[PDB]
Amino acid sequence: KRHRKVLRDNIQGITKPAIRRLARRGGVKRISGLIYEETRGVLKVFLENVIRDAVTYTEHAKRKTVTAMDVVYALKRQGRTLYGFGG
Amino acid sequence: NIQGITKPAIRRLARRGGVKRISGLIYEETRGVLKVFLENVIRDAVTYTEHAKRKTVTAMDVVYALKRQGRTLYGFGG
Amino acid sequence: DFHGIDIVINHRLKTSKTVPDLNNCKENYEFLIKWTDESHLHNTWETYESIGQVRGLKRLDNYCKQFIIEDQQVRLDPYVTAEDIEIMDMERERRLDEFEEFHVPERIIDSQRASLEDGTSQLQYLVKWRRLNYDEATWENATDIVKLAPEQVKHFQNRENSKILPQYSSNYTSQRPRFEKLSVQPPFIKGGELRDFQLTGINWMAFLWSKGDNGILADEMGLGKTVQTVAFISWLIFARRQNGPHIIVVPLSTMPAWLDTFEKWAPDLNCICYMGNQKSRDTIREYEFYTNPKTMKFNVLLTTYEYILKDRAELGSIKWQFMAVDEAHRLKNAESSLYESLNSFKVANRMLITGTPLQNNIKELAALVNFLMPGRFNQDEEQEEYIHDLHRRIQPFILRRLKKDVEKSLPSKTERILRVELSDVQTEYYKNILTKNYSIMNELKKASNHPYLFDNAEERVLQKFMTRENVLRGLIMSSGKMVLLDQLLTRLKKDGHRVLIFSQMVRMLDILGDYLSIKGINFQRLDGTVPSAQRRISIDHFNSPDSNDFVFLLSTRAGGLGINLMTADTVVIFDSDWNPQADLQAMARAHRIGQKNHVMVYRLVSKDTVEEEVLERARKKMILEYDMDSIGESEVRALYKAILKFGNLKEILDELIADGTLPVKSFEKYGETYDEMMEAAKDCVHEEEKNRKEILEKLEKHATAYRAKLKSGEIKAENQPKDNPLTRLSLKKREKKAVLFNFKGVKSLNAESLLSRVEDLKYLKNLINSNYKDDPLKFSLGNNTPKPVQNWSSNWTKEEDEKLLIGVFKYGYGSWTQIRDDPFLGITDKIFLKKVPGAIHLGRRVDYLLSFLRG
Amino acid sequence: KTRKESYAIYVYKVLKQVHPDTGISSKAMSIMNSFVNDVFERIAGEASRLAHYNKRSTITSREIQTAVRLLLPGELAKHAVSEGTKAVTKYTSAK
Amino acid sequence: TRKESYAIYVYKVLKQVHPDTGISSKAMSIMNSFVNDVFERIAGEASRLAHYNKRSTITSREIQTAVRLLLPGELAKHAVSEGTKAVTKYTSA
Amino acid sequence: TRSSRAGLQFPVGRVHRLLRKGNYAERVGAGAPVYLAAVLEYLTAEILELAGNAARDNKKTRIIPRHLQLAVRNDEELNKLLGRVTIAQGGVLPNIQSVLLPK
Amino acid sequence: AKTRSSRAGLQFPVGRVHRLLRKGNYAERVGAGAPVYLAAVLEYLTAEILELAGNAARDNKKTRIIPRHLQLAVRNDEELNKLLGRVTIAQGGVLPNIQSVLLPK
Amino acid sequence: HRYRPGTVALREIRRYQKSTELLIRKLPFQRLVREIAQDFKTDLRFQSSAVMALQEASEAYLVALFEDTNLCAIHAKRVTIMPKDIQLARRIRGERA
Amino acid sequence: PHRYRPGTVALREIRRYQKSTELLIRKLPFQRLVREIAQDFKTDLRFQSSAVMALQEASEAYLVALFEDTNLCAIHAKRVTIMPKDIQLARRIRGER
DNA sequence: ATCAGAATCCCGGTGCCGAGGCCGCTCAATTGGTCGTAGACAGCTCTAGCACCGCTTAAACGCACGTACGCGCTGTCCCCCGCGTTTTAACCGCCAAGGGGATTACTCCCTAGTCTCCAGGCACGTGTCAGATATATACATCGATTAACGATGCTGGGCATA
DNA sequence: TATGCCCAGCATCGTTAATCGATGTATATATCTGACACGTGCCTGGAGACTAGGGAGTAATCCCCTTGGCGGTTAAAACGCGGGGGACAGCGCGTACGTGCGTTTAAGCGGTGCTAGAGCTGTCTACGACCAATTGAGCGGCCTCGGCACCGGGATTCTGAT
Ligand SMILES: Nc1ncnc2c1ncn2[C@@H]1O[C@H](COP(=O)(O)OP(=O)(O)O)[C@@H](O)[C@H]1O
Ligand code: BEF
């Protein structure tokens, strides 16, 4: 064809063997089928809040560029202490 | 005085929790759960009490100890 | 190791409807299947019931399915037209052209004699095929390779005969020799003749090479910059004796072009490049050195830019002395991986062949200065002094030969701009984006000439109803460059010209792929997606004089990547690709020397947009255009073996020294030692005869003295005395000694084998050269039949006697290591080390043949 | 005698503004007092750390604004920003 | 901009137990941000505790009980011993 | 007073002293206690409003802490805001699983 | 001596943490032995952490300390895991914990 | 007569869900907490409201964790609780040291 | 070749992934997805090279721990295959539902 | 389809105690003025990201095959439960009581503020020493080849006898 | 002339010795990189030194908030017995999931046009803290009575077993 390239939604970027490897590190022998579809929703709920807090800290600092310290502050606010990238 | 917590106490706690039928050797370990979850709060109460240069456990130190661990309590000061 | 199905070649019918299913493909059609782990010459027409369960079966199922759909698209469809038949049938001859190239070899990598199951050992060649990667290199016996492509076998033997190993290379690192500026051309250009500025450039590169310095070749694109490099390397190897390995990095797109030009101008030098990924790396490593804990069998190779960064340990562990690079604009910034990577290779001299604009940024010129000379070294007011000193400071280390000296044989040059206005779609897509609706910064610059770049754009223009003419009509009228491009394209089609379209965006190339295909315009794309096996077929198809592809699409970096178009003349550019001189180098792929019907260039300048500011910024960066007489024991023994192998060495001594046996000495010393060895040999034979005859006379006197006592009766007849002059005389007749003499420590040196060797080899040279000089494979003997074999385990006739003297005529006597590996004789399984064909056992037979022909 | 501080006669006004016929016990009164003190502690500490991250020496209205936006779940944050900015606007427009 | 980071103050402690090992940059940031985080936890706990008892200052007892609270036992015992030993060493000298 | 000029009910000078004596920042703002008092007034109006409705659900005049528990646990955003909060003298919602019904 | 770090017999800077207490805005007045005490406690913390990191680097035959050595050095201890409960170390991993019932039997 | 076993527990749930008072007595709990705190530290005095604080505060955990245990039982297609349900809730919540 | 035992290869992948110190989720889909969600939430935004790593490792933190607790829910349920009710029970006991 | 039965809710009556409200009075917020100062504003100096380009090359997925595990169902074992029977101590309230938390006053001490330098610390060029990599040179040990020597075996070219 | 007898003639087999070359092993030298210690240069916060005063340590006082006992009785706690729905051992089984395979696709290693934007040093003005004065609200302490707590009696409401 070589006409158009429609990607639909970008939620399909995380495929099956990715979460298969995540569960492989977690310690799961064999998984099911309709698990990664809900897993993307779990990451969505546990992601829109961190992104929202990052946008809030970014907009509050009189700037329109998300840095790295605001992510550490947003994660530490929700009880997810993360090191390595400052703090 | 671990025998003070009788069976009907854990029974009423089970009905408030929402269980239709319980087992047998459950309150025996439940007293251990309350003991582990209690010795740290009491330890913090003796810590805030002794640090206050006075030997009297008040009510604000309990609220501070519960809010420190992540379980906020209202009513008894705050 | 398994014998499974690899790919599918051809297909036909087996037994001589609406839709044939798989059953009809089983019991009604046979398919040519190519097997894995085997060459393409073993293709057999097999189906499913003839091979059973074999490794790999889904490929033939998918190919047969595409053949079923194809049959549904040939004559089993009421919607097929006329061009679809030429396209679907064109794919047949396309695949045939892509499959017939795998049957002809292209190179012989290695040649190792492997054993079989019957105990015999046959010499098999590591065959490299055409239009294929270094992988899938199967071993083929020497019984059919010489019967199909003898040029590859003869050239493969020429690569081994022409010993150009680095151990013979000179070492002028301590003192450079006397250089002489030549004016004529060396007898190494077998392709064509050269003009004057080519030899001038060669005299400049060799003029600066003798001073231990490096320069930059900054000439015009088309003046033979590649041929000057090959001629400079060949003249440097065969002139200054610099046979060492030389690395020449060439992009992957230009690598086959440099291979064809390299073999067409210098066929005496190999051109084993470096391609592949995994198995081809194992091929280059197994061909690089021998399996031992240092056999350099190469010198000139071609390595891509990505292969350097991917493999730094393999290329970094090898010493180099000369480095050449085409299109050296990649070193624009001194903080790149390639810039620090090329500086890691311990080399001696470098050469930059490019024409990058060294005026827009000082870090480019300075980067090219410290890249080859580590140590050497703003405001507009001080710019006249900075270039007043740096200009003449860099002039002796640069070549600036403009095209004004070569316009006597080139057509005129012209260019016309075209300020194309915007439309309503460009107005709403130019204003409504920076307001509210979206449906960041560079997307406007990309959409400043064509609106079809998002998703909600095709259905917005179509205000009605699948149609075909309305879509193209709404597609051409969306921008002025499409209407004017179609009008100018029609105008050029009314006469007959080859028009090119250079675009930066890769999506616009697909849009043109969907627009030009409906209008019935045959073309082929060229971007950075298809591999070399496809773009090489496309370019080789465009260079045909009867090609129907009058439109050829390119790109920016991929368009101006390399190679050239000779039949193209019209260059249409949609917009400037945000780089000065990038348009000059982009038109340089079509506007060349071979073009005769002039060159017409149209620049579609976008008026009242954002590209004109970038064009002005490109014009702002364009206005700036500123011991020898010592013979040891190993030399006496090695020279003695050279006499036992070649005989007289006063005529081809240059070929007997460069082989690696005779050290670098004076030829007069070899002549004096040869005359002393032959003279002392003849004198030693003369003294051996004068003394031997006297000994025979003494044995005749003592023998007669014994017979005088024997015929009398003083010797008993019961026991014959074995200690008498008669027995020692009979043993003296059958003596087991030779004319020996010690010459300068070396002992055990026969003098008769030297004289008889010069007589036999001289009679062979005069006998062969006096009858067949330019055709040694047609020499005969007539009726001279020697004695038959003495219990040999192989057939031997007169043809073996005629072909046996060819190996002695070419390689010499005693060189049985090359006779058994020579496929031009047929004695593959007739020469071994238990066995009958021995080393000396056959050599004495050759001596009997020579002694039989001399008598 | 110790004069302790508590939000007693400040909540019954808002209570009567929406329910002028209900009451509240002293237990839940202390629950609401400690609740207002707890929210004051969370907003004060959040504005403190947020004022310390940006090297700021003062806490104006935007710090409490983003502290309320980050402390509330959804619509309550928007209503608190509109009502709060309305109160600050009325306080600034007047004396 | 001269940024503040605990760099030379970690080598002097590492060489006293391992004078022959290395350290990466990412793990160095882990140690730096770790000490900063523990400083925020102890300073914050001592601040809120200093505000609870109506205390207008922070001495050594607040850090002592804050250490005894943030640590379950062993680390609190040895931290109190080494801490009081350091305060006694600084006061006596 | 600033509370009457701001048009609110919660105090401004006392909470301002809490911002000064609380030892939080070196300086203080001008409209910070008014904004905070408005937010606390909104939360007070919402909590006391749902507490009044919960009081009317059982025909009771004086609101009990159980009405606060049933008023906070019944909402979604209020339950998300007060997750680890235990109201004094409260209870639980009458939530019984359908799998425990006699069927 | 001159600096308080050398007089106290520690390694962490006493003036740095003191200035952080004067600037962090946590108390109106500071003490006299607070930065030395906190410096000693932090010195013990980094001492034990760097010790278990050294062992976590010697058990796998490694020279430099990687974040995985810190992860495996903290997660293996009970009190360190209790202290760093809601803590996620970057560039680390998890403990190789495989259930006994998951083995093929 | 004989009532169905199980439904009386349900009506006891309906009766206890409306109560707003404690369940465990104050003197056994006072002697337990006073004995544990006495063994932890001698000579200690507590407040009368602290008994209610630790009382209802302990009941909140003994009701939330017990409810999570009940959900762990329902998840396993059973109604009778097991110690592995409490250990599972403590392991998943993360408070299990 | 032959047919290996099903499930043992999974344990081999566990032994191979337990020693890995890098990431598992690819970077380009994560940037294309997170940048799309953040772009739909707020227009005109710019991220940092380190923020992608922080959201990547921080995401895989609860993406691995949540799958560990879910695996515990599958083990307690007398099963070996995870179910959505294990995810729901994990989010229920965790408290972040 | 149904009927007596324990709980459960509503109506009527008693009755109970603590917030609403009143008296007052204490003291921190309110103005008004003065003194100290923080960061908003434009732009200098860069600066990593906005998009893609060249160019791979390992993976995602449809496809086909095997297979096996929890739902469903069968059958059996079991363990608190409704209810009756037999102990049992917490507490409403009262009584004695006692000593440490809170208050006020006296004293005290040490520290943020200020005035006023100086080597610790940050970045980087320079330097010889751990390991690691060849590298010219020498010595010892074969692998294999070729020239040389001891003994012929028919084979070819001629000499004495049928 | 044919057949046994004399005199060469290369290849058959085996054995000795010299030679080119590969393999193994030192042995002092010339790179490679990776430094950790020192001096180069400069920034600046902590320190050398004084102090007034407000929070902090300590003594005498108030009392009231918390401790230790005392009869009665009441709902509350412990045992027990037949048992019936719940938990568990075990088989049928079929559709979803793990296991190979080929092809297209997108993620990854470098480059590359700028360009809106991060940090800050010029500049000062409205923003922010402290000090008199007063004055009106918040809260300490006590009285009223009505919403609600509690019990007796009449509906009432599912509910187990027929
Ligand atoms: N010495 C020569 N004589 C004739 N033609 C030449 C010569 N050198 C180059 N050419 C022409 O130039 C073309 C090759 O272009 P080339 O110079 O290799 O491109 P590049 O700019 O990459 O060096 C060939 O088609 C050939 O016809
Ligand atoms: F100008 Be050349 F074709 F590179």
| Paired sense of beta strands C29-35 and C523-524, if any | unpaired
Q: Which residue is nearest to nucleotide J80 (CA to C1')?
A: B23
Phi, then psi, of C52 in degrees rounded to 5? 75, -150
Q: What are the Cα distances from residue C320, in Å, to B59, C166, C236, C271, C335? A: 84, 10, 15, 16, 24
Which long-range CB contacts under 8 A does I41-45 form with residues at least 24 apart? Answer: I41/A48, I41/A51, I41/A52, I41/A55, I42/A55, I42/A59, I44/A64, I44/C440, I45/A55, I45/A58, I45/A64, I45/A65, I45/A66
Residue C291 marked as a ligand binder: no
CA triple H6-H10-H16, angle to 5 deg? 135
Q: For the beta carbon of residue E3, count every other beta carbon within 10 angstroms.
A: 5
Burial of residue H13 (number of CB atoms within 10 Å: 0-12, 13-18, 19+): buried
- Strand order from edge to edge, sheet including C523-524: C416-420, C600-606, C570-573, C499-502, C551-553, C523-524
Q: What are the Cα distances from residue C186, in Å, to C195, C203, C266, H22, I6? A: 13, 12, 12, 111, 71
Dihedral sign for Cα atoms in the order C570, C572, C576, C577: negative
The token pair at C474 is: 């709404």
Buried b (16+ CB within 10 A) or exposed e, C801-817: bbbbbbbbbbbbbeebe
The token pair at E53 is: 């008892």
CA distance H64 to F85: 12
Strand runs labelled E in E5-79: 22-23
Question: Is the CB of residue E47 less than 8 Å away from at least one CB of chain F?
Answer: yes
Burial of residue B46 (number of CB atoms within 10 Å: 0-12, 13-18, 19+): middle
Helix axes A36-60, A69-77, angle to 10 degrees: 120
Residue by residue, DSSP assigns C352-406 as EE----TTS-HHHHHHHHHHHSBTB---SSTHHHHHHHHHHHHGGGEE---GGGS
Q: For chain B, what is the largest distance between any 2 Cα atoms, rounded to a whole number of angstroms?
A: 49
Please tell me whether residue C6 adopts helix, strand or coil conformation: strand
**Residues paired with residue C416 on neighbouring β-strands, in sequence order:** C602
CA distance D5 to E34: 40
Please tell me whether residue I24 adopts helix, strand or coil conformation: coil
End-to-end CA separation in angstroms for chain G: 69
Contact C364, C332 (CB under 8 A): yes
Which long-range CB contacts under 8 A does C43-52 form with residues at least 24 apart? Answer: C43/C9, C43/C10, C45/C12, C47/C14
* CB-CB under 8 Å, B57 with H46: yes
Phi, then psi, of C475 in degrees rounded to 5? -90, -35
B1-78: CATH number: 1.10.20.10
CA distance I52 to C381: 46
Contact C852, C782 (CB under 8 A): no
Task: Name which of C221, H11, C792, C376 is nearest F94 in CA terms.
Answer: H11
Homologous superfamily in CATH for domain G3-88:
Histone, subunit A (1.10.20.10)
CB C310 within 7 Å, strand J:
yes
What's the per-residue H, E or C state across C227-274? HHHHHHHHHHHHHCCCCCCEEEECCCCCHHHHHHHHHHHCCCCCCCCE
Task: Name which of I85, H17, H92, H10 is nearest F97 in CA terms.
Answer: H10
Question: Is the CB of residue G30 less than 8 Å away from at least one CB of chain F?
Answer: no
- CATH number for F1-86: choose from 1.10.20.10, 3.30.1060.10, 1.10.10.10, 3.30.465.10: 1.10.20.10
Helix axes C225-239, C197-209, angle to 10 degrees: 50
Q: How far is the CA of I3 from the C1' of J67 (A)?
A: 13
Q: Give the class (CATH, top level) of H1-97.
A: mainly alpha
CA distance G48 to G51: 5
CA F101, distance to chain mean position in Å, is 36
Contact C552, C516 (CB under 8 A): no
Task: Name which of E35, G59, I53, E52 is nearest B65 in CA terms.
Answer: E52
Q: How far is the CA of B45 from the C1' of K73 (A)?
A: 37
Question: Is the CB of residue D48 less than 8 Å away from at least one CB of chain G?
Answer: yes
Residue by residue, DSSP assigns B54-73 as SS-B-SHHHHHHHHHHT-EE
Query: From the CB of C54, is ligand 2 less than 6 Å away?
Result: no
CA distance H46 to B48: 12
The token pair at C794 is: 């192989």
Question: Is the CB of residue A6 less than 8 Å away from at least one CB of chain C?
Answer: yes
CA distance C69 to C86: 16
Please tell me whether residue B1 adopts helix, strand or coil conformation: coil
Task: Name which of C416, C441, C453, C426 is nearest C609 in CA terms.
Answer: C426
Q: For residues C791, C793, C799 and C800, what is the CA-based torsion angle, rounded to 10 degrees?
A: -90
Taking CB atoms and an 8 Å cutoff, what residues of chain A touch G94? 25-26
DSSP run (H or E) holding C500: strand C499-502
Nearest alpha carbon, ligand 1 atom 10: C224
CA distance C845 to B42: 112
The token pair at B65 is: 């100890």
Q: What are the Cα distances from residue C34, in Å, to C14, C38, C94, C141, F76? A: 18, 8, 18, 19, 68
Homologous superfamily in CATH for domain I2-97:
Histone, subunit A (1.10.20.10)
Homologous superfamily in CATH for domain A4-87:
Histone, subunit A (1.10.20.10)
Please tell me whether residue I13 adopts helix, strand or coil conformation: helix
CA distance C535 to H8: 84
Contact G88, G70 (CB under 8 A): no
Closest nt by CA–C1' to C813: J146
**What single letter denotes the amino acid at residue B28?**
E
**What single letter denotes the amino acid at residue C309?**
L
CA triple D5-F82-A75, angle to 5 deg? 110
Cross-chain CB nearest to I67 (options A18, A26, A55): A26
DSSP run (H or E) holding C141: strand C139-141
Helix axes D61-71, F32-57, angle to 10 degrees: 30
Q: How far is the CA of H22 from the C1' of J14 (A)?
A: 28
Please tell me whether residue C113 adopts helix, strand or coil conformation: strand
CA distance D68 to D39: 10
CA distance I73 to I87: 8
Structural domain boundaries in chain A: 4-87
- Give the domains, in start order, of chain C with CATH numbers: 5-102 (2.40.50.40), 106-161 (2.40.50.40), 166-408 (3.40.50.10810), 413-620 (3.40.50.300), 629-713+720-750 (no CATH), 771-855 (1.10.10.60)
Taking CB atoms and an 8 Å cutoff, what residues of chain F touch D66? none
- Listed in sequence order, the residues at least 6 apart from C157 whose beta carbon sits closer than 8 Å to its beta carbon are none
DSSP run (H or E) holding C112: strand C105-115
- Listed in sequence order, the residues at least 6 apart from H29 whose beta carbon sits closer than 8 Å to its beta carbon are B4, B5, H51, H54, H55
Taking CB atoms and an 8 Å cutoff, what residues of chain G touch H84? none
DSSP 8-class letter at B3: G
CA distance G88 to G92: 9
CA distance C103 to C128: 10
Structural domain boundaries in chain H: 1-97
Phi, then psi, of C214 in degrees rounded to 5? -125, 145
Dihedral sign for Cα atoms in the order B66, B68, B72, B73: positive
Burial of residue G38 (number of CB atoms within 10 Å: 0-12, 13-18, 19+): buried
CA distance C269 to C302: 13
The token pair at C852 is: 């039989």
CA distance C756 to C759: 5
**What single letter denotes the amino acid at residue B44?**
D
CA distance C8 to F66: 80
Task: Name which of C813, C750, D63, H41 is nearest A57 in CA terms.
Answer: D63
Q: For residues B65, B67, B70 and B75, what is the CA-based torsion angle, rounded to 10 degrees?
A: 120
CA H37, distance to chain mean position in Å, is 20
**Residues paired with residue C140 on neighbouring β-strands, in sequence order:** C125
The token pair at D6 is: 């508590």
Q: Which residue carries 């929202």 as its tokens?
A: A52
Q: Which residue carries 């095709």 as its tokens?
A: C458
Please tell me whether residue C194 adopts helix, strand or coil conformation: coil
Taking CB atoms and an 8 Å cutoff, what residues of chain A touch E34? 83
Residue by residue, DSSP assigns F49-94 as HHHHHHHHHTT-SEEPHHHHHHHHTT-SHHHHHTSSEE-TT-----
Phi, then psi, of C141 in degrees rounded to 5? -70, 155
- Give the domains, in start order, of chain E with CATH numbers: 22-92 (1.10.20.10)
Which long-range CB contacts under 8 A does D45-54 form with residues at least 24 apart? Answer: D45/F24, D46/D70, D46/D71, D47/F24, D47/F25, D48/F24, D48/F25, D48/G25, D49/A73, D50/A60, D51/F25, D52/G24, D52/G25, D53/A69, D53/A73, D54/A60, D54/A61
Task: Name which of B45, G80, A87 is nearest H41 in CA terms.
Answer: B45
* CB-CB under 8 Å, A56 with D66: yes
Dihedral sign for Cα atoms in the order E2, E4, E8, E11: negative
Strand K, nucleotides covered by protein (CB < 7 Å): 7-8, 10-12, 18-20, 22-24, 32-33, 36, 45-48, 55-56, 65-67, 76-78, 83-88, 96-103, 106-120, 127-129, 137-141, 147-149, 159-161
**How many CB pairs (< 8 A) connect D and F?**
167
Burial of residue I57 (number of CB atoms within 10 Å: 0-12, 13-18, 19+): buried
CA triple C495-C498-C502, angle to 5 deg? 135
Query: From the CB of C588, is ligand 2 less than 6 Å away?
Result: yes
Contact G102, A29 (CB under 8 A): yes
Residue by residue, DSSP assigns H49-61 as HHHHHHHHHHHHH
CB C555 within 7 Å, strand J:
yes
CA distance C123 to C822: 9
Task: Name which of C499, C559, C501 is nearest C535 in CA terms.
Answer: C559
Phi, then psi, of B18 in degrees rounded to 5? 105, 50
- Strand order from edge to edge, sheet including C300-303: C300-303, C246-249, C322-326, C349-353, C215-217, C398-399
Contact C573, C603 (CB under 8 A): yes
**What single letter denotes the amino acid at residue C667?**
F
CA distance D37 to C608: 63
